[PDB]
Design a protein around this ligand. Sequence first.
Ligand SMILES: O=c1[nH]c(=O)n([C@@H]2CO[C@H](CO)[C@@H](O)C2)cc1I
Ligand SMILES: O=c1[nH]c(=O)n([C@@H]2CO[C@H](CO)[C@@H](O)C2)cc1I
Lengths: 300, 304
Amino acid sequence: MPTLLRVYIDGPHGMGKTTTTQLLDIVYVPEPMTYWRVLGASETIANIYTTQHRLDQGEISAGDAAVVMTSAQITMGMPYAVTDAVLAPHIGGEAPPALTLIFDRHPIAALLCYPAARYLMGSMTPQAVLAFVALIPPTLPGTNIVLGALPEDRHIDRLAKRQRPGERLDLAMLAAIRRVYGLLANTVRYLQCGGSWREDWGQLSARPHIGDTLFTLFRAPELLAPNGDLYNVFAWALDVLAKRLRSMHVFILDYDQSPAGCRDALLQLTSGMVQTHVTTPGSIPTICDLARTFAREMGE
Amino acid sequence: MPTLLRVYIDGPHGMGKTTTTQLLVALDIVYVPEPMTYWRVLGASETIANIYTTQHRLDQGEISAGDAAVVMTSAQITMGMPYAVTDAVLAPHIGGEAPPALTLIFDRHPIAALLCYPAARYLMGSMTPQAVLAFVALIPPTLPGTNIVLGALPEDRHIDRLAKRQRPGERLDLAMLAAIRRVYGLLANTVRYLQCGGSWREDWGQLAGPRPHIGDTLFTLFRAPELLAPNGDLYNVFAWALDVLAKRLRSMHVFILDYDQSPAGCRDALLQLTSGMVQTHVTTPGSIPTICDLARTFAREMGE
Ligand SMILES: O=c1[nH]c(=O)n([C@@H]2CO[C@H](CO)[C@@H](O)C2)cc1I
Ligand SMILES: O=c1[nH]c(=O)n([C@@H]2CO[C@H](CO)[C@@H](O)C2)cc1I
């Protein structure tokens, strides 16, 4: 059957990601803004940033924050999750392509990166983070993930110029999310170089050091037993983390250039990306409508 | 290679489910229990208590539906966590459909936390139908050999027994008993509907044994005004969530166990049903031992 190329442009918010994808037999699955502001719940982006503000202000407790942040992250990841579930059966083994699917973010942004960042923010429990991790859908073949690079001071500049409605400029949240995605990129390399977190776990007390991968975040006292040992349930959540990330193809896009440049840069990276066959000839058209319908309904 | 038999004993609470499985294992069979220690300690503090108090508060009007929902949605994540990792860690060892060299008796299936309780809580006014669908979209792929046993018990018998099966922190909420009973009845119907070639998209306009009316399956719950577009049609996102619902439930093997008997009887009844259950091969003959430790470690750490 025809081949399909899927590209998930992910990374921290405030880099120009949505723009450069606009700038690119190619369909675009944008940011689920209408689902975040209306369909799933009322103004979720606003709810998220206010809560952190309240928490930071001490007007609420960490536990209230957590209960709100955990509930909000469910809403934020819903469109990403169904799309993947409805898409999964059409994806065949790894294989110009007959269809290029450009996505605005992968499911891991809602199910992993933002939760870890919010945990780093004091607004989410590490146990919840692992619950979302356990819920990460099996990584299909041809999962090419593009993460962005941008010097911090420059990022503060782009971050400022484009806050979604309800957003607040939280530089603390900018540092946590940037940290989380940096670790995510390291975790993939670590894993692909044969890294075994169980073996390198003690080091927390070619290939990155386990202390430079996401695994270092789960060395939290809530997840450890009176003797330091990670509880098995959590250890298993890490086995899933390892599993999900290892088959992902990560590509780095430098956002410290102009929109036409980022667009150009994104097109070059496209060559080393993994393609796949679809499961039926009629998967291409179906995938198309899916994307085109997702956009029409949830795009804003 | 060796074969494996998986049996998930599910259904409403207060029926004696956990008991009969203990009894069954007391008879190459490992038991994966309700993860109470994870609910009361490891994942969070006294989650069962949190759940029932919230409903109480809500019912009392001491809090709003929106607060309730934020708490129920968060609590249900904690409740389903052990179920979810267990399935993800188990999934690669499961081979195609095939005396089992190992029988894995589970205490509920991931759908109890990811589907049934949420729908029930939605029915209770403590959860949004949008949240319910988010959990439904997170339901892990249904492995081959997923035999689910659901229980039957007349309402009055259940009512009295419920009162006799209060978990620490639970309250006798008969409204929640009716909602959950309703949700699981629908679940059983949905599976038959699906196996009889039912298409919710076709029967949408309408909202063993023959096929049920879509109005008697879970699909009827999602005919909620929150999920309805200006034109009266379901939003696509939610329609897709129902495609996943249909997909996940259609490959499940549902068996009904009558709990209106004695514990030794339920145990005996459970053993007969075991014959028509689907077995599967493991992916590595050494999957058998691994699965064993998994279950034996899950129990030792989360059982309580
Ligand atoms: O799970 C998520 N959680 C969030 O808080 N966001 C944020 C939503 O608002 C903006 C969308 O980029 C960013 O500020 C990220 C995104 C996701 I995807
Ligand atoms: O998702 C769930 N949510 C729940 O509220 N429960 C309830 C928890 O308390 C008892 C044991 O699980 C029953 O009252 C069910 C179980 C599950 I599994």
